[PDB]
Design a protein around this ligand. Sequence first.
Ligand code: HEM
Ligand SMILES: NCc1ccc2[nH]ccc2c1
Length: 391
Amino acid sequence: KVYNSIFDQAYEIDPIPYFNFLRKHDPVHYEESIDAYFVSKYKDVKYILKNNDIFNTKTLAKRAEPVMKDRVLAQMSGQEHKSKKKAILKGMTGKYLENLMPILEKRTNDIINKHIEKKEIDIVNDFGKVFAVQSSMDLLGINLENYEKIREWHNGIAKFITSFNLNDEEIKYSLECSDKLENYLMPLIKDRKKSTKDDLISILLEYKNDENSISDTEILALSLNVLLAATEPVDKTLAYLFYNLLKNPEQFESVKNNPKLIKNAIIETLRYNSPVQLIPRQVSKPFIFNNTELQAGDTVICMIGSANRDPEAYSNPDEFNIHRSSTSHSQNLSFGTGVHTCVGASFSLIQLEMVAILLLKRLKNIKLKTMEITEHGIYTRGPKSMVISFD
Ligand code: HEM
Ligand SMILES: NCc1ccc2[nH]ccc2c1
């Protein structure tokens, strides 16, 4: 009936032609392999995410609980969601943020110092994947000793969350990974209870729901939620940022000349190469977009990358342009919108600006070595490698 499928081999290699086709010819597109509709236009994605009652987050509960071990922020609503969301934000704002950022500068310079004498560095594999997990561990309060194993287990859990047809042996490994992370993490939650530090895990322990407190298994689930949420997109976005700047030498120079433009470059990178590509919701009642009827219990999947390149929301949407100013410009959907918008958005922009500015300060006469990237992932998406040389 319809011959263009999200799961075509061509899609993961280059989804942009698919974005353009779907928005123009099938904006609410059914995929029988996973019994879900993919939503490609900016207007409809925005509407879905802004109407949490019609499109709720219970979808993200069977695709999460197996590894998260208890309730995650997305599953919550009402006063509980708002107050716990505020608790998490407390660990990346105020005094917690003032303390964290010097530490993330250290993380960054320690990685740089590991590679500076080789005169090249892989922004994906040498920097991004290491910095991303370490920064998440520092946010939480986890000692960097076992960070290599933390990365391994994180990868296994993330794969279960971001995948669509896992086989039985792949599933069993993702679960093992989450037990090892639980086995590792629960003892530190039990130690943090007594001696209390100034980190996010202690914030969660001091939480007061009137006079109640989240169970340890729920602190673990929320701690795992932050670990997964903060790690995955940081690597990808840093790589995309430097790739796009170097592929547009004139814009790279504008940033070098006015470093303030770096914030805009990060935002444009998040729009152009959205590292979180899909956001699922469950339909709570009969509903219709364009011609396409949806029923209660159906699953819709917002295509963030498609929406962020919608010509109805941006002029020249498929061009990287750090100087976009609000013929047509909209707020991008890379952090979502509405009730469940990313709690880490402001911290992410601050952390990414710090790292980019330090890389630009210490690596002189940067030159691209990976002339053509190859990207992988349809749920979370980024380059396999992104190597740069420097003096
Ligand atoms: C460039 C970096 C990041 C991007 C692109 C990103 C993207 C997103 C998106 C698109 C959502 C919405 C998911 C939905 O509506 O179902 C989300 C939610 C969330 N993100 Fe991020 N995120 C990033 C960094 C972070 C960081 C650093 C944290 C730190 C803890 C974090 C924690 C969360 C949490 C807890 C949620 C759930 C929000 C809620 O349910 O109210 N993320 N993120
Ligand atoms: N907070 C960003 C984010 C959103 C969805 C995700 N699915 C797996 C990891 C992950 C991270």
